[PDB]
Amino acid sequence: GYEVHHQKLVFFAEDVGSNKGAIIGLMVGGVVIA
Amino acid sequence: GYEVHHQKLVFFAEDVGSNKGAIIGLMVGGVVIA
Amino acid sequence: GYEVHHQKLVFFAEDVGSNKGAIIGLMVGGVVIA
Amino acid sequence: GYEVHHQKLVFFAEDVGSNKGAIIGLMVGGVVIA
Amino acid sequence: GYEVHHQKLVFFAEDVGSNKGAIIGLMVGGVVIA
Amino acid sequence: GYEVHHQKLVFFAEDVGSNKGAIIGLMVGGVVIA
Amino acid sequence: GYEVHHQKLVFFAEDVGSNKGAIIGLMVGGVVIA
Amino acid sequence: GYEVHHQKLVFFAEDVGSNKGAIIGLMVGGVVIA
Amino acid sequence: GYEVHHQKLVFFAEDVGSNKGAIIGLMVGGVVIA
Amino acid sequence: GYEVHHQKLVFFAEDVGSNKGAIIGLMVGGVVIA
């Protein structure tokens, strides 16, 4: 018998304020210019 | 017997205020200019 | 016997206010100019 | 009998303020110019 | 009988302020220019 | 001065033959039974 | 002066033959039963 | 002066034959039963 | 003056045959039952 | 003057045959039951 519970993944846990750049959770490939 | 419960994935957990840039949860490929 | 329950995926959990940029949940390809 | 509980993964635990660069949780491949 | 609980992984535990560079939690491959 | 060119994203680069299952490029939510 | 060129992202580079299961490029959320 | 070129990301470089399970390039959240 | 070229990331370089389980390139969160 | 070239990252360099379990390149969070 197996169980997994109350597992969490959070990228940004708290607030984001006044960014003038680039904020990305998960990026796969691509180009980011900030 | 197996179970998984109360699993969560959150990119942005708290508020986002006054961004003048680019905020992306998940990006695959593409170009981001901020 | 297997079960999965109460699983959630949330990109933006809290409010978004006064953005003057670009907010994208999921982006695949494309060009974002902010 | 096995169980795992209250396991968490957090990239950014506290707030992000006034970034003018690039903040990425998870990056796979790609180019980041900040 | 085995159990694991209250295990956590945190990349950035406290706040990030005014970055003008590049902050990445996990990077696999890719190029980062800061 | 910045430029990005000849960037491509391809889900299936070569041919698909005689599938009796389910082939999906991008899936968001939903249920797939194959 | 910055440039990025000839960048590619490919999920399946070669052919797919006779699948009786499920092949998905990118999956976000959802349930896949194969 | 900076440049990046001929960068590639490939999930499956060669052919996939006769799968009766589940093949996913990128998975974010969700449940996969194979 | 800086340059990066001919950089590659490949998850599966050669062929995949007759899987009856689950093959995932990149997985973020979620539950995989094979 | 700096350059980096012919750099590669490969998770699975050779073929995968007849798996009845779970093969994952990169896993972040989540639960894998094989």
Residue numbers in the entry:
A (entry chain E), B (entry chain G), C (entry chain I), D (entry chain C), E (entry chain A), F (entry chain J), ...: 9 to 42
Describing publication, verbatim:
Adult individuals with Down syndrome (DS) develop Alzheimer disease (AD). Here we report the structure of Aβ and tau filaments from two DS brains. We found two Aβ40 filaments (types IIIa and IIIb) that differ from those previously reported in sporadic AD and two types of Aβ42 filaments (I and II) identical to those found in sporadic and familial AD. Tau filaments (paired helical filaments and straight filaments) were identical to those in AD, supporting the notion of a common mechanism through which amyloids trigger aggregation of tau.
Type I and type II Aβ42 filaments were present in both DS cases. Type I Aβ42 filaments have a crossover distance of ~30 nm and are composed of two protofilaments packed with a 21 symmetry. Type I Aβ42 filaments, representing ~50–60% of the filaments in both DS cases, were reconstructed to ~3.2 Å resolution. As previously reported for type I Aβ42 filaments in AD29, the structure extended from Gly9 to Ala42 in each S-shaped protomer. Type Ib Aβ42 filaments, reported as a small fraction of the total Aβ42 filaments in sporadic AD (sAD), were not observed. In contrast, type I Aβ42 filaments and type II Aβ42 filaments are formed by an Aβ42 isoform ending at residue Ala42. Type I Aβ42 filaments have been previously reported as the predominant type of filaments in cases of sAD with abundant parenchymal Aβ deposition in the form of core plaques, while type II Aβ42 filaments were found predominantly in cases of FAD (AβPP V717F and PSEN1 F105L mutations), as well as in other neurodegenerative diseases, in association with parenchymal Aβ42 deposition in the form of more diffuse deposits. In the two DS cases, we observed both types of Aβ42 filaments, present at similar levels. Our cryo-EM study shows the presence of type I and II Aβ42 filaments, probably reflecting the presence of parenchymal core plaques and diffuse deposits in the two DS individuals.
